Amino acid sequence: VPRGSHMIVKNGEKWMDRYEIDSLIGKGSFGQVVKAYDRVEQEWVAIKIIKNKKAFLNQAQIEVRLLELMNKHDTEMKYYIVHLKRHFMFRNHLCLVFEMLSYNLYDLLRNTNFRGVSLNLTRKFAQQMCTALLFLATPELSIIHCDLKPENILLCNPKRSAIKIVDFGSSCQLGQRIYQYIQSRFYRSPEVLLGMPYDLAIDMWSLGCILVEMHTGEPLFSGANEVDQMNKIVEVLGIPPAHILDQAPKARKFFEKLPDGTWNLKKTKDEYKPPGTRKLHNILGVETGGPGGRRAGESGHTVADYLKFKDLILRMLDYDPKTRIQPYYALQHSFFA
Numbered sequence: 001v002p003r004g005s006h007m008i009v010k011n012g013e014k015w016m017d018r019y020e021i022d023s024l025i026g027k028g029s030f031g032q033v034v035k036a037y038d039r040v041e042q043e044w045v046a047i048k049i050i051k052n053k054k055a056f057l058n059q060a061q062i063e064v065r066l067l068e069l070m071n072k073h074d075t076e077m078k079y080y081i082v083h084l085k086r087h088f089m090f091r092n093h094l095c096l097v098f099e100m101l102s103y104n105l106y107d108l109l110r111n112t113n114f115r116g117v118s119l120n121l122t123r124k125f126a127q128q129m130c131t132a133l134l135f136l137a138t139p140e141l142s143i144i145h146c147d148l149k150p151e152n153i154l155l156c157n158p159k160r161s162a163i164k165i166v167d168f169g170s171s172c173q174l175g176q177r178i179y180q181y182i183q184s185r186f187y188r189s190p191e192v193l194l195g196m197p198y199d200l201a202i203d204m205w206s207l208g209c210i211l212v213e214m215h216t217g218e219p220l221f222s223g224a225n226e227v228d229q230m231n232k233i234v235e236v237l238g239i240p241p242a243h244i245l246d247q248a249p250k251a252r253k254f255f256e257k258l259p260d261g262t263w264n265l266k267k268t269k270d271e272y273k274p275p276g277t278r279k280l281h282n283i284l285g286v287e288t289g290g291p292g293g294r295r296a297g298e299s300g301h302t303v304a305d306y307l308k309f310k311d312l313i314l315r316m317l318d319y320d321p322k323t324r325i326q327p328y329y330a331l332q333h334s335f336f337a
């Protein structure tokens with residue numbers, strides 16, 4: 001019986017006279033993902049090997065349940081989610097076999113030297129991701145991904161724009177609270193930072209942050225910690241509405257109520273641009289040739305195009321989860337006309 005939690009996986013070995021292990025795709029907290037040739041079906045597969053650890057096995061069984069639940073819907077919208085082919089136990093690990101995909105949107109950014117992809121490619125990713133979130137919002141699913149980031153969105157094919165969402169290991173359904181901390185820090189919604197109730201709208205917040213990053217090459221809100229995260233959000237979007245902060249268990253982690261009932265930023269221990277002064281209009285370079293002016297004198301990057309993109313992003317980055325744009329309405333936006 002092995003001591004480590006990780007499965008020993010030797011490149012070139014063959015599992016169950018079926019799966020020819022080629023290479024490691026990536027390692028994580030959960031375990032690893034290996035590229036393997038399925039000799040029975042004659043196709044490449046990504047095998048997700050879960051660590052022999054109770055927390056990770058629990059997460060993986062939830063991910064299996066949610067993926068199988070999505071599998072039974074007929075809609076074309078379901079193909080924006082990675083397809084789980086099968087799962088089995090092997091050398092005492094849960095193994096999930098997925099369709100082989102290409103590299104992730106962070107790798108795509110690194111291949112641009114973090115200068116960003118075109119607004120035309122950003123629009124394509126945006127439409128597919130809004131369609132995927134519409135699928136998760138199906139009432140019988142009502143799945144909150146809770147970890148949307150460039151690394152969990154993968155190209156199907158390296159030469160094409162088709163994408164899929166992977167990793168439902170931190171996911172839950174509408175009304176559940178399972179994990180102390182949720183969302184990757186850069187992509188973490190205000191409601192989660194403020195310890196407030198969360199629904200499917202937190203995934204739309206993450207998408208808004210991701211889409212700006214895909215076009216600029218840099219994270220919109222790159223917090224070192226939760227206080228820095230909230231402060232960088234405030235630089236762009238201003239002090240959150242009073243009706244939110246007044247109900248927020250963790251309002252006083254970031255803000256203080258003054259005697260008039262108005263909220264300001266909490267004092268530092270002892271740096272940020274004033275609230276609302278880091279305008280998204282200028283981050284995107286709407287009037288100034290796009291990010292760093294590098295898009296002036298390309299097509300598909302007009303002021304008209306940028307204004308529609310910014311308007312949609314700011315609807316996705318609404319502080320109020322009740323009024324934040326929902327996938328159904330985002331798809332009708334003139335940005336997609």
Ligand SMILES: CNCC(=O)Nc1cc(-c2ccc3occc3c2)cc(N)n1
Pocket residue numbers: 025026027028033046048082098099100101102151154166167168
């Ligand atoms: C490191 N981030 C975690 C992670 O890789 N998770 C993950 C990855 C994959 C997956 C599926 C197909 C793939 O083709 C190439 C890589 C790859 C990963 C699927 C699921 N459900 N979760």
